[PDB]
Each structure stands twice: as C-alpha cells, then as structure tokens.
Write a protein that binds this ligand. Sequence first.
Ligand SMILES: CCCCCCCCCCCCCCCCCC(=O)O
Ligand SMILES: CCCCCCCCCCCCCCCC(=O)O
Ligand SMILES: CCCCCCCCCCCCCCCC(=O)O
Ligand SMILES: CCCCCCCCCC
Lengths: 385, 385
Amino acid sequence: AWEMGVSDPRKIVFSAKIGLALTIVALLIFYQEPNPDLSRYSVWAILTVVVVFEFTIGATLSKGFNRALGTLSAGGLALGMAELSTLFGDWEEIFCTLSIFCIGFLATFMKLYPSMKAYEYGFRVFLLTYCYILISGFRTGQFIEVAISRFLLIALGAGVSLGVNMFIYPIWAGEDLHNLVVKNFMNVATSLEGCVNGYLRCVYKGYRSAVESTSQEESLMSFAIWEPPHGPYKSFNYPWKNYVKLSGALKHCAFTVMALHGCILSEIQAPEERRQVFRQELQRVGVEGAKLLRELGEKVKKMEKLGPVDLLFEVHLAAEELQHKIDKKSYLLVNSECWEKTYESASALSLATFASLLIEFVARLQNVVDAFKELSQKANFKEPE
Amino acid sequence: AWEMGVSDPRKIVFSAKIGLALTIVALLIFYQEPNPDLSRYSVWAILTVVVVFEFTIGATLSKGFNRALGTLSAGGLALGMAELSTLFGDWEEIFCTLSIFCIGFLATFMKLYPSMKAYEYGFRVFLLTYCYILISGFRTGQFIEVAISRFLLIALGAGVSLGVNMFIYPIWAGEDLHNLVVKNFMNVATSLEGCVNGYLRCVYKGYRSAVESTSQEESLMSFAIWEPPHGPYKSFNYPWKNYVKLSGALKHCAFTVMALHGCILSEIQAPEERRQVFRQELQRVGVEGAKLLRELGEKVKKMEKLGPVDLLFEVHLAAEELQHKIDKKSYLLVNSECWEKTYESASALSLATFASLLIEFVARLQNVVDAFKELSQKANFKEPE
Ligand SMILES: CCCCCCCCCCCCCCCCCC(=O)O
Ligand SMILES: CCCCCCCCCCCCCCCC(=O)O
Ligand SMILES: CCCCCCCCCCCCCCCC(=O)O
Ligand SMILES: CCCCCCCCCC
C-alpha cells in the first residue's frame, strides 16, 4: 500500500528500475531489430530480465554465474548426445527418449540432497535447456544454430539487466549485515529491560530476532563476498565473518534473556511481597546491562575503537551487590524449620532461579566484549579520540 | 548416493515418475504428431511438467490453481489492451511501451508487500505472460489464436503431470504431519533423558527439531486440505487443525528442556559432591517423564483413545518426593551464617535452579494431556480395548 512505499521508498526505486529495463528491452525490439531472424526468437530477451534481476548486486552476480554455468553445461551435453545419436541409424528416437529419461532421473535425484539444496534454479535451468535443445532441433539438424542464436539473445538481456541495476542506484548487500548487527544490540537491550520491568511490575520479537537470524546473516555474507570495494569498505578482503562471530556471541547471551522471559510465564510463581525486597539491585543490573549493550551498538555503528576505560566495572559491581543482598536475606527462600506444601517451596525457589539467571546473563558479556575487540582490530577501526 | 537411495526409496520413486512423465511427453511429441505443424509449439507441453511436478499431491493442486489464475489474468489484460491501443493510431508502440512500464511497476510493487511472500511464482508468471502475449503478437492478427494454441498444450502437460503424480504412487501431506508429530514426541523424550544423564555425569537435535518446525506443520496443514479422502482419513473435513495444537503444547513443554540444556552449559557450576545428594529423585523424575512422553507418542501413532487410569500419577509422586528432599538438605545451597565469595554462592545456588526447572517441566504436562484428549475426541479415535 501507499504507506509501505512512503515508509520504504527503496522498493519504489527497485520497481522503477525493473520498469525502465523492461521498457528499454521492449523498445530495442519494437524499433531497432531489422533482422528478420531475430524476430523469430526475439521474445527471448524480455524473459531474461524477469529472472536475473535481484535486489542486491551480489545476489544477481552469483545467481547469474550459477545459471550461466548450468545453461552452458546443459547445452554442451545436449549437443554432444545429439551428435552421438546418429551412429545408431533408424533407432534415433529410441535413444533420445532413453537419454531424456536418464537425464531427468539424474537431474532430479541430485537436487533432493541437502548439501546441493538451495541451488535448485540451476538444476531447473539445466533440465530445461537439455529438454529444449534435444526436442527442438531433432532431425532438422539445426542443433547448433538454435543454440548460438538463443545464447546470443539471452546475453543481451542479461547485460541490460545488469547495467541498469549496477549504475542507477545500487543496493549493496554488505551494508545490510552491518545494519542488522547494529539492530540486534538494540533489540536485546530493549528486551532485557522489558523483561525486568515485567517481572517487577505489580520483548518477544526482541530476542527472537537475535536468536532467529543466523540464516539471514549467512546469506548476506554469501552475497557480500561478490561485491567490489566501495565506500567505507576499501580493502580487497573485508573480514565479513567477524560480524557473524559477534552476532553469535550476542545470541549466546540472548539465550539467557529468553530463559528469563520463559521464567516470567511459568505456572509456579512467588508472592509479590517477597519479590519487592530485591527491586533495587535487579533494576540497577538491568539498567547497567542495557547501557552497556547500547554503548557497544553505538560503537559498532560509527566504526570506532574501544576507549581506555573498562566498560564492565559497573555491571560487575552491581552483580556483586546483588549477590551480597541475596546472601544477607537467604532465609526467605528455603524452609529452615525442617532440617535433617510443594507449591510454597517452588514459589520460594523461583526467586533464586530468577537471580541465578540474571547473574549468568551478567557473566556472559566478556565473550561479546572480546569478539568486539577482535572485530575492531581486524577491521581497522579508527581511534575514538 | 546409496545413503538415501537405500535409506529413503521415496526419492528414487519421485525421480522415476518424473522420468516416465518426460518420456511420455517426448514420445507423444515425436511419434504421434504426423507432421511438423507445431514443431515449435510442441515444447510448451514438455516444459510445463518440469514446473508442475511437486512432492505432494496438495502442493501440485494449490500451485496449479495459483499458476492458472496468473496465466489467465495476464492473458485477459493483454487481450483487453491490444484492442484499446488501436485507438491511438499514431502513438501505438509508445502506448504499448507505457503499458508495459506501468504493469511491470505495479507487479513489482505488489510482489514485495510483506504479506505476499510465498507467491512470487504467480507474479512472475503474470509478468511473463503479459510480456509474451504483448510482444510476440504485434499487428499480426494472432492474439487470440496464439493464446488458444499456447493454452491447448499446457493443459495436456498438466494433465500428464497430474496423472503420473497421482495414479502411480501418491505422497500425501496428511500422512506426513502425523509422522512429524510422532517424531517430535520421541525426540522430546530423548532430549529430556539426555539432559539429566549429562547433568548427573561423573540432546540438542531433539528439542531443536521440536521447537523450530512450526512452519513445516503449517505448510503441511495448508497442503493437506486440498486432498480427497483416502485410507484411514475418511471424512469430508478432517480436523487437521487439532495436530497443530498438540505440537504447540509440546513446544511449550520443550522450552524447559531447552532451558535445562542451557543450564548444563553455564559458566557457574555447583560442586559434584553436592550434586550427588539428589541423584535418585532426578533420575526417577526423568524416567517417569520419558515413559509418559513415549506412551503418549505410541498412543498417537496407533490412533487410539486413552484408557480409564490416570497417566500422570507416577510422575506426580516423583516430583513430590524430590521436593521433600530439598526441604531436608536446604543448608547445602544457602549460607546460614550471614542471616541478619560470589562465585561460591552462585555455584551453590545453581542446583536449586536446575531442580526448580525440572519441577516446572513436570508441572507443564497437563496441557499436553488435555490437547491429546481434545484431538482424540474430535478425530474419532477407537476404544483402546
Ligand atoms: C531459467 C530458464 C532457462 C530457460 C532456457 C531455455 C533454453 C535456453 C537455450 C540455451 C541455448 C544456449 C545453450 C548453450 C549452447 C552452446 C553450448 C556449447 O556448445 O558450448
Ligand atoms: C530464459 C533464460 C534465463 C536464464 C539464462 C541464464 C542467465 C543469464 C546468464 C548470462 C551469462 C552471461 C555471461 C556471464 C560472464 C560474462 O560476463 O561474460
Ligand atoms: C509463459 C507462459 C505464458 C505464455 C502462454 C500464454 C498463453 C495465453 C494465456 C491464456 C490466455 C487467456 C485469455 C483467453 C484465451 C482464450 O480465449 O482461449
Ligand atoms: C507455465 C505456468 C503454469 C501454467 C499452467 C497452470 C496449470 C493449469 C493450466 C490449465
């Protein structure tokens, strides 16, 4: 709807590009095509623009390379079999049908594999080009004319699809990984405070996005290694994998926020009066952790190094004060009368469970800090100063 | 190769059926056709099979409905604009070019709405059919003839595809949802046993599969509604929506096994000497929970109702016994000399979190039992006599 466009004008630009490219093709065929032969197979160029035009440059480049490899191999095999069939005269069809059967079975078995999956389009292109080349030419003997004619009419369509995408308003794939890495930190920082406030009162997406985005970052890293140097990224081998390593380090910490949110939604709960004895320490720990995560996200957004001061001092001190307070009032968690109702005991122990989970969350931050240091060192970030 | 060629003969049958379909189409094109009257139009029938053959019988029907509404809306548009462009006698190809631009822009915009993913094939067929119809037939009075001809062969290819797929060997999705549910029931129990065994030592795949498959169940439910009654599922409207409820209840129960697995990999751990004090009760609770989950899975597999005895009586006793033990030795988890180091306190307190999380897992089973009863009542299960 209009709202979606206004919010994301980029998509409108992509649609405009698609339309300008199809218009260019259509005009080049409506006017500048005097040769009659092309007319016979001139509807082959305006159908290579609707399949190779992708959102990013890297995706377009890699998928086009795969499709061209598939098409070339299929054409070569088809022509070879066509030439070899003539040996057995009067039995041509009884050979070409067995060939189409063996090749359909093979090109259908290898795709169903998990390793070779995620590359179906190439197998489909191979099977379609083999069937087309075998059936089309047949006895007429034009097994090579058709091939070179169509390859050379597809090439023009793919060139017109690539030039317009690359030279109007490029949408690079290496900046979406940077922006998703930036966004995850803020999502987790919001989730932690949301959970703490929800537990202390008288989130969902925040941790799902961090815990459920590895595949998107792996696809964006597969597309980002194909793009040439541009803008802030000038090295010839940008360490795109340290972003994934930092994302994993952050997901390992977000699993504890997921466990705390699941602790909020439990069947057995504790009396509010008991929870209101530890409010200050929990709120301090939550504020400190949110501040640390937001500072790390801000330093990742601006491509800057860490300063001299230690960032984990205050959160460590807050967690130590929390531990001291828990140690001072431990008589509200266990039953001291008997020492040699189940619901009451579970309610008593749910508070120690919550505190232990918060302490584990505070203890899992050093790995994220180390991963950030490694990324800022291999990626040549600038001095904060 | 042989790994799945022998561990899953379903794929060899799928590939052999696609080969037999291609061979049938090829023989019908080469032998039956008396003379080369449609030599170039006899490939649209051998290129539809490669794009209409799916794994299940409901996916073929649904994607065929979508592709047959998108292969006719474009045709109607093209035929209704080729009789309107004539009005502009001078600006003919200019008006056709503006039409192609507008239609491509509109389709590309409407293909990116976040609500319309999982249908890109329909918009692609729409654009390719509008472009083919408009470009291929120009001035030459063959719009309607070209369309009738191009639709008289895709129908035969689709009929051959849907006869081979269905009448040789059919794969149904309503028989795959049941198997997925049974597999999830088995995996959750295996993970539950593994977690306790690992914690008491002197798992990942199960809950990870049973918590990250909702999309597969939703797709299988969307495909299973198109299929006609067959085998044991003899009813006009089978309650396929009562399997998803049980799957969701099992995922809610498995989140606690995921939290216990996260407890195993924590940075703060309790001493072994204090762990060995509660071995028996934890082993009993794990055994009882695994037995109950396996019993429910076996009852689901055989399509049988629950008997007259309570299925939660033993685990409810086990989880109560553990509580009593916690009451008798609480001094091993708290410091009773400070009532008025952090690492030692956290190590002591982790055991209460692990035991308190197993109590939550034991408490979350009534919802799964209720969902099973509802499913067995709505689906007309048989008496367990
Ligand atoms: C993605 C859909 C693919 C549809 C393609 C239809 C058929 C394409 C025809 C391709 C003709 C060129 C193939 C290469 C022939 C030359 C190979 C060679 O001998 O080295
Ligand atoms: C209907 C056909 C669609 C698929 C066609 C294959 C995809 C186009 C591939 C074009 C490859 C052009 C050659 C690439 C290498 C080069 O730039 O020289
Ligand atoms: C790539 C697939 C599209 C090419 C095939 C297009 C064939 C025409 C589509 C059906 C036209 C529908 C309009 C009514 C046709 C009729 O009068 O029979
Ligand atoms: C080429 C896209 C699919 C067109 C055929 C759809 C199946 C039903 C045709 C009557």
